[PDB]
Amino acid sequence: MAVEEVIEMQGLSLDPTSHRVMAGEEPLEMGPTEFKLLHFFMTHPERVYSREQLLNHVWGTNVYVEDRTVDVHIRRLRKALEPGGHDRMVQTVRGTGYRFSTRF
Numbered sequence: 001m002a003v004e005e006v007i008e009m010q011g012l013s014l015d016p017t018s019h020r021v022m023a024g025e026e027p028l029e030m031g032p033t034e035f036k037l038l039h040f041f042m043t044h045p046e047r048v049y050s051r052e053q054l055l056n057h058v059w060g061t062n063v064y065v066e067d068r069t070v071d072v073h074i075r076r077l078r079k080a081l082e083p084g085g086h087d088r089m090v091q092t093v094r095g096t097g098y099r100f101s102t103r104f
Contacts, residue, residue, distance in 0.1 A: 007042045010102045012086055014042055023084035030080040033058060033073045041090065041100035050097040067095075074098060 007014040011024040019035050021028045036058035041049075051070040055061060059069075071092075078087035091099045 007039075009042050009045070010086065010089060012038075012042075012081075012084070012089075014039060021080075023081070023086060026084060028080050028084065030076055031073065034077040034080060037073060037077050037090075041098075045100050045102055046104050048093060048097050048099050054098070071095075 001013075003015055004017045007016070013022040013024070015021070016039060019032060021030070021035065021038065037054065040054070040057055049057075051067045054070050055065065055067075058073075059065060074090065074092065078090050078092075081087040081090065089101055091101050093099060
């Protein structure tokens with residue numbers, strides 16, 4: 001278990017190299033966008049992020065997608081964390097923004 005910078009947060013081992021996530025051991029596959037959200041959330045824990053911010057970071061405003069699209073990918077990410085029950089970490093602050101609440 002060693003590859004570049006493996007971000008092990010709350011047992012959620014994220015591998016930016018292979019775009020892979022392991023909840024302690026259980027592999028969790030999902031879309032690249034979902035992976036980006038999680039990776040960005042990990043590099044910026046306990047910080048409220050609006051749809052606009054995520055779009056300007058993860059999506060990098062590559063395409064003029066709707067704000068709703070953020071909720072769609074966020075739902076995918078959360079659902080991907082549903083088995084491990086880690087979805088709770090990705091807090092959905094209504095339709096205002098989101099946040100990665102590990103524990104602090």
